[PDB]
Enzyme design. Structure first.
Site, short mmCIF file in Angstrom:
data_model
loop_
_atom_site.label_atom_id
_atom_site.label_comp_id
_atom_site.label_asym_id
_atom_site.label_seq_id
_atom_site.Cartn_x
_atom_site.Cartn_y
_atom_site.Cartn_z
N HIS B 41 0.81 -1.21 0.00
CA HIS B 41 0.00 0.00 0.00
C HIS B 41 0.84 1.26 0.00
CE1 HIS B 41 -0.15 -0.43 4.64
NE2 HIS B 41 0.31 0.80 4.47
N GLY B 143 2.69 5.63 10.49
CA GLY B 143 4.08 5.58 10.09
C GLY B 143 4.76 4.27 10.38
N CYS B 145 3.76 1.21 9.54
CA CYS B 145 3.61 0.11 8.61
C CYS B 145 4.97 -0.36 8.10
CB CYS B 145 2.73 0.53 7.44
SG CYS B 145 1.00 0.83 8.02
C1 G65 Z 1 -4.14 -0.86 4.95
C2 G65 Z 1 -3.79 0.45 4.32
C3 G65 Z 1 -4.12 0.71 2.99
C4 G65 Z 1 -3.80 1.91 2.38
C5 G65 Z 1 -3.11 2.88 3.10
N1 G65 Z 1 -2.80 4.12 2.50
C6 G65 Z 1 -3.58 5.23 2.52
O1 G65 Z 1 -4.68 5.25 3.06
C7 G65 Z 1 -3.02 6.45 1.85
C8 G65 Z 1 -1.73 6.44 1.36
C9 G65 Z 1 -1.20 7.56 0.74
C10 G65 Z 1 -1.95 8.72 0.60
C11 G65 Z 1 -1.36 9.94 -0.08
N2 G65 Z 1 -1.49 9.91 -1.55
C12 G65 Z 1 -0.39 9.18 -2.19
C13 G65 Z 1 0.91 9.96 -2.15
N3 G65 Z 1 0.75 11.26 -2.79
C14 G65 Z 1 0.45 11.11 -4.22
C15 G65 Z 1 -0.32 12.00 -2.11
C16 G65 Z 1 -1.63 11.24 -2.14
C17 G65 Z 1 -3.24 8.73 1.11
C18 G65 Z 1 -3.77 7.61 1.73
C19 G65 Z 1 -2.78 2.65 4.43
C20 G65 Z 1 -3.10 1.44 5.04
N4 G65 Z 1 -2.76 1.18 6.38
C21 G65 Z 1 -2.68 2.06 7.42
N5 G65 Z 1 -2.15 1.75 8.57
C22 G65 Z 1 -2.36 2.76 9.51
C23 G65 Z 1 -1.96 2.51 10.90
C24 G65 Z 1 -2.17 3.44 11.92
C25 G65 Z 1 -1.80 3.13 13.22
C26 G65 Z 1 -1.23 1.90 13.47
N6 G65 Z 1 -1.02 0.99 12.52
C27 G65 Z 1 -1.39 1.29 11.26
C28 G65 Z 1 -2.95 3.88 9.01
S1 G65 Z 1 -3.32 3.68 7.34
#
Ligand code: G65
Ligand code: G65
Lengths: 304, 304
Positions: B41, B143, B145
């Site tokens: 991701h 942060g 992950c």
């Molecule tokens: C399963 C998953 C799937 C997708 C994502 N990624 C996103 O939601 C996400 C990733 C990047 C962006 C930003 N975009 C991409 C980069 N840039 C072009 C700007 C726009 C916006 C959203 C995260 C996760 N996992 C996460 N883990 C957490 C987390 C928080 C606390 C403890 N453990 C994990 C928060 S989000």
């Protein structure tokens, strides 16, 4: 989310652990620059633990009586001296893995990480608090003497504890890295025992804040107490007095949750007087006092 | 003496942690030989988490879209591929600090150490169990992950967990290092939630043995139960069934304490039906299920 007993990553200390042998006694030492630090009782015999005179025992030793091994490499001892209850073995090689470091002495109520070692080999890492009676409730077996406790700030390891002994109730005692014992304990055979202990109130309050930040709120109430009235209750339940400095130290966590310290003290009073009524806080059915305010801020989200 | 949640020393894994950036997303990766492993991701956007097609998203990436940093050193990406829910970034430099390692998948009820990292930098280490519902009760912030879970046997690191996400109740889910999720979870935006959980009975029994070895005996009794009769009680209190293999696995601890497994099961039945009546076991007022029989043997004295 979540809240765990979290230690500091141990790699910087792992690279400092060596095995020190003198006679048929083997224990751990700490190799920093060209000095190995270890408990001075490595020079003792079973016929010496009664009333040892360590100055005599050390005068009868030579450098060749100390075998120091770092992994599979033998370090040549070229000097030896005593400092309080530790021995300083000068070796002919500086440790290339020496981190930036400090020797600090900690206060009761502060926490640190312990790297438990056997035969110079690291075995596990866990978090410990210095109790008010200057013992620690560690996990150590025979062979663990010379294991160290430490905190890490940026790149710098602050060593604060070297393990020397287990007391009759199963708790542990040792020294700072200048060789000065924490509390009224000695490295000889006596009937010494841990004194009465108390619960670390500012830490319990910090952990209640951690719980709020993590979504446990059932113990909150609309009441606030005064500091003097809280401290009457603390006395009754064998808690340490809360000071204004403690209230100040809890300032950041109070601001983040919007719950004033004396508001949270009214919750703690109710928990002390009533118990939990079958509920838990951060997966515990007891009030936990081995997280400092720093520990909570380090681990918990900062949002609000 | 003593019994702590003890992690494995983390140095061998610390030397493997890197920062992976793609776009404006930064998370952690694991650098072994000339490959960096990280959650796929990292290639997602906020407009992509709805219904992402990762095969599409990756075809639109090039090696130059991935910035990999090991400390203050930038690693050049020379290949990229997907494996299930992880990404494999081939880099032009093998990690000189690569330990002997294995990728293992663990079973519910087994434990492991977690090295929590932010921006490629290790922050803390703690012990975790895989719950029966395939979540872990970790401590992770935004942060984190790409942080990994592992066990160490002699010189060999067995990696078993990479962190991917936090579920609504605050517990955590992720994959093995082949990229296959533990449990019925996906790396996209859904209403997914942890399913019902159960207590790990063989671990509770192991921890009662740890308590006996450490001198807590108040919960022992003269009664023995049958395995079928014990398992009726387990069902009622949402404990997992006890098998003959579990009894066999507890054999060494039974022999060391001289307390038969079905004898200890009669104690556990009484604790489940009556509670503790104000007492504690190894400093807990709850029955603790995140120590395996191995964990107990590893940490506790072996005498008897
Ligand atoms: C399963 C998953 C799937 C997708 C994502 N990624 C996103 O939601 C996400 C990733 C990047 C962006 C930003 N975009 C991409 C980069 N840039 C072009 C700007 C726009 C916006 C959203 C995260 C996760 N996992 C996460 N883990 C957490 C987390 C928080 C606390 C403890 N453990 C994990 C928060 S989000
Ligand atoms: C405080 C102290 C003072 C002296 C000693 N050393 C001894 O009792 C001792 C040391 C060496 C010998 C063997 N002799 C010397 C070597 N050789 C000539 C044979 C005879 C016999 C006894 C140990 C300690 N500390 C100990 N720590 C532990 C311990 C156990 C579990 C957890 N933490 C610490 C056991 S003994």
């Amino acid at each position: 989310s979540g809240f765990r007993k979290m230690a500091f990553p141990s790699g910087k200390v792992e690279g400092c652990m060596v095995q020190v042998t003198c006679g048929t006694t083997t224990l751990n030492g700490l190799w920093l620059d060209d000095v190995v630090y270890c408990p001075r009782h490595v020079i003792c015999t079973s016929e010496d633990m009664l009333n040892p005179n360590y100055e005599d025992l050390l005068i009868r030793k030579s450098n060749h009586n100390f075998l120091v091994q770092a992994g599979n490499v033998q370090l040549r001892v070229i000097g030896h001296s005593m400092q309080n209850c530790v021995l300083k073995l000068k070796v002919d090689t500086a440790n290339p893995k020496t981190p930036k470091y400090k020797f600090v002495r900690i206060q009761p109520g502060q926490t640190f990480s312990v790297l438990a070692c056997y035969n110079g080999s690291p075995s596990g890492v866990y978090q410990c608090a210095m109790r008010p009676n200057f013992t620690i409730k560690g996990s150590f077996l025979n062979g663990s003497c010379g294991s160290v406790g430490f905190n890490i700030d940026y790149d710098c390891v602050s060593f604060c504890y070297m393990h020397h002994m287990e007391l009759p109730t199963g708790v542990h005692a040792g020294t700072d890295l200048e060789g000065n014992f924490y509390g009224p304990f000695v490295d000889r055979q006596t009937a010494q025992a841990a004194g009465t202990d108390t619960t670390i109130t500012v830490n319990v309050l910090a952990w209640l804040y951690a719980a709020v930040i993590n979504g446990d709120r059932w113990f909150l109430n609309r009441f606030t107490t005064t500091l003097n009235d809280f401290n009457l209750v603390a006395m009754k339940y064998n808690y340490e007095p809360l000071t204004q400095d403690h209230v100040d130290i809890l300032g950041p966590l109070s601001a983040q949750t919007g719950i004033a310290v004396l508001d949270m003290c009214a919750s703690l009073k109710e928990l002390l007087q009533n118990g939990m009524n079958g509920r838990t806080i951060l997966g515990s059915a007891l009030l936990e006092d081995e997280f400092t305010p720093f520990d909570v801020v380090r681990q918990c989200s900062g949002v609000t």
